[PDB]
């Protein structure tokens, strides 16, 4: 019956796009039905237009298969020796100990892993020209925004969120990249010099090589409290458990050289610093909590339970709050708030416990860890797709505060300030002026830029990088071109391949991809008519949008899986997101904190009263008031 029913699953494959033939004969029966199935609606309807119940249902199926084909391991597993993790009932200060079959999984230098296979474009790291490809594609022309959807305050959480989760170990040896003569007028920098990716052998013949990643890929909140045991103690007082802070202004504090002290401020700016801010007193508050319910908890007790506290108040408001005015959309509305209390819905949950499936009761409070077979870390592919520079915007509109707010709490413009005297040590003496709440406020009333060709702050095309440390470095770079660098030299595939690795149907023609008549030009010229050499990041920009959608379906689809990931992979989310592991006190806190509002209320209990009219502290701040769609949601259908 196996037999004969593969047999025809090899007759179905006359409906399967060609270019999935080989992924494939990989997969299980059953799923070789599924794939069917989504390719079937990817053909017909696709999933986005379809009533929110079949669109979930279709995003289930897409996932699950996913994370059964399009997560590959790089590198021997960091196993190490047997542990207990009871012996480990809190986030350790390099990642370990985790995974409680591999000490290493998730830890401080640990491999990226992939989801998709490497793509070796070491002949091709310069072609097309990626200067050529920065200035004709990437550079902001004319500045697009997210209309009221997506704030400053949403631009400043994902570099706040990436600052945790990814950084690439570098090599010591330098590479120079130089400007054709054909755009040299039009690049900031003639040339520039950076560091290669390190190249780490893995010692397999599937995948040789991979890079390492200096944060650690557990969502553990190390932007505030580093990736080690020595960074970890430059941010801890030592008292009651908590986090180093300025007392009197609520921002952080600097060492000798004006560097802020927290996490990790690698290429930061004053954005980051305020979310850094704001959490550590997050952290801090959490201790006092506990200092009080018990009076034996010592330093290192109140650091480990605030942390586990702080962290998870972080992962929610990422899921629940940000993630859905990134897709805003009523299915992506109901998937994301699926993904941490199920379909049963938070008042089910909180009434009677967890469901017991992922489905019904969410990732979160599941039993077990859950890895589908492929130790846990964030990918090169994850990276690609989270390069979302062209959020920035040329300078940031400060507000005036003191004014009486108007319709819809609109305050007027007192100065603008260019995004250059906002950025690293510079931006840390510049917020010292601003303050806190003025930056908050201005940043809440302020639209991102979106993520659309020629949108790429020019002044990243010639910025000071950092060192890890946040030490500024001699040599400058294009930003632009050296994202497009990066990607070709991690091996990610180009757009194309990427999308075949993720049995999307690749595009045959520039207008499948954008309907941008002059942006279909330059892509031609750029790439010389061919959709196989088509830069991953380019692709990813270019493509039309799902409305509702900052991100393209292409990148979605890599959040869809290592979104989820994050979460239940974690034993800190899922066996041990308990109040034995948390508190009573320590579970209810984050079991009560709903949004980045709730947040920012507690801290500065006036501040949204007064100045946020949106229901989202993600979204634009002076946005009208919306009455709520009276279709049950599972129920909405997409226009
Ligand atoms: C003032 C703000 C920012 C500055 C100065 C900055 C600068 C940089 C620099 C210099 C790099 C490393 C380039 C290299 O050597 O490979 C980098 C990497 C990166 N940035 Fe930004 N960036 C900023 C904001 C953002 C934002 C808003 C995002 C949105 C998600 C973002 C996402 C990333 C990602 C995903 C990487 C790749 C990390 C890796 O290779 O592991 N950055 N950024
Ligand atoms: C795992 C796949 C998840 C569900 C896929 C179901 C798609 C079929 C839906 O067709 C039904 O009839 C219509 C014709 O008018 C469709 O357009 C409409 O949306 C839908 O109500
Ligand atoms: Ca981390
Ligand atoms: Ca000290
Ligand atoms: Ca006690
Ligand atoms: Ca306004
Ligand atoms: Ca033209
Ligand atoms: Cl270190
Ligand atoms: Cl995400
Ligand atoms: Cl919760």
Redesign the pocket.
Do not use: G
């Given at each position: 019956m196996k037999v004969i029913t593969s047999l025809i699953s090899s007759i179905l494959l006359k409906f399967i796009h060609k270019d999935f033939h080989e992924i494939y004969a990989r997969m299980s029966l059953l799923d070789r039905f599924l794939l069917l199935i989504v390719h079937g609606v990817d053909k017909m309807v696709p999933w986005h237009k379809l009533p929110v119940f079949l669109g979930l249902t279709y995003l289930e199926v897409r996932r699950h298969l996913h994370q059964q084909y399009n997560l590959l391991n790089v590198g021997q597993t960091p196993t190490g020796i047997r542990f207990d993790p009871a012996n480990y009932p809190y986030r350790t200060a390099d990642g370990k100990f985790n995974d409680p079959f591999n000490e290493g999984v998730g830890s401080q230098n640990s491999f990226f892993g992939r989801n998709c296979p490497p793509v070796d474009q070491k002949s091709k790291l310069r072609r097309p020209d990626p200067m050529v490809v920065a200035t004709k594609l990437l550079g902001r022309k004319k500045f697009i925004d997210t209309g009221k959807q997506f704030n400053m305050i949403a631009?400043s959480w994902?570099?706040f969120m990436?600052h945790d989760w990814?950084?690439?170990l570098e090599d010591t040896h330098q590479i120079e990249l130089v400007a054709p003569k054909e755009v040299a007028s039009k690049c900031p920098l003639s040339s520039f010099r950076?560091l290669k990716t390190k190249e780490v052998p893995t010692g397999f013949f599937e995948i040789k090589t991979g890079s390492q990643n200096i944060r650690t890929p557990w969502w553990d909140s190390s932007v505030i409290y580093g990736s080690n045991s020595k960074t970890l103690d430059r941010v801890r007082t030592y008292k009651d458990g908590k986090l180093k802070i300025s007392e009197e202004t609520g921002l952080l504090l600097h060492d000798e050289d004006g560097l802020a002290i927290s996490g990790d401020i690698r290429?930061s700016?004053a954005g980051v610093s305020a979310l850094q801010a704001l959490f550590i007193k997050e952290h801090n508050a959490v201790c006092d909590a506990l200092k009080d319910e018990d009076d034996d908890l010592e330093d290192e007790d109140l650091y480990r339970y605030a942390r586990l506290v702080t962290s998870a108040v972080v992962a929610k408001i990422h899921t629940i709050d940000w993630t859905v005015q990134l897709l805003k959309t009523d299915t992506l509305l109901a998937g994301m708030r699926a993904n941490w209390y199920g379909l049963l819905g938070k008042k089910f949950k909180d009434s009677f416990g967890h469901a017991g499936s992922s489905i019904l009761g969410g990732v979160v409070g599941m039993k077990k860890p859950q890895n589908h077979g492929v130790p846990y870390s964030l990918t090169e592919d994850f990276?690609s797709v989270?390069?979302?520079?062209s959020?920035?915007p040329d300078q940031l509109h400060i507000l005036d505060i003191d004014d009486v707010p108007g319709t819809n709490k609109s305050l007027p413009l007192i100065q603008e300030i260019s995004?250059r005297d906002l950025?690293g040590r510079k931006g840390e003496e510049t917020m010292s002026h601003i303050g806190f709440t003025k930056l908050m406020v201005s940043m809440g009333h302020q639209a991102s830029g979106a993520l659309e060709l020629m949108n790429y702050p020019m002044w990243?095309r010639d910025?000071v990088?950092h060192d890890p440390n946040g030490q500024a470095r001699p040599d400058h770079?294009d930003?632009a071109a050296?994202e497009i660098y990066?990607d070709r030299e991690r091996s990610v595939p180009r757009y194309n391949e990427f999308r075949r690795s993720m049995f999307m149907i690749p595009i045959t023609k520039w207008e499948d991809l954008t309907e941008d008549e002059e942006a279909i030009e330059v892509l031609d010229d750029v790439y010389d008519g061919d959709v196989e050499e088509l830069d991953l990041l380019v692709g990813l920009m270019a493509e039309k949008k799902i409305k509702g959608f900052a991100i393209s379906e292409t990148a979605f689809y890599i959040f869809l899986i290592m979104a989820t990931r994050r979460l239940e992979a974690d034993r800190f989310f899922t066996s041990d997101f308990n109040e034995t592991i948390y508190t009573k006190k320590g579970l209810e806190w984050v079991n009560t904190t709903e949004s980045l509002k709730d947040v920012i209320d507690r801290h500065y209990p006036d501040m949204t009263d007064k100045w946020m009219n949106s229901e989202s502290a993600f979204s634009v701040w002076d946005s009208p008031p919306l009455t709520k769609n009276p279709i049950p949601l599972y129920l909405r259908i997409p226009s």
């Open positions: 631009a994902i570099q990436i990814i950084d690439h950076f290429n700016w990276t989270y390069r979302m520079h959020l920035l995004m950025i990243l910025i990088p770079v930003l050296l990066r």
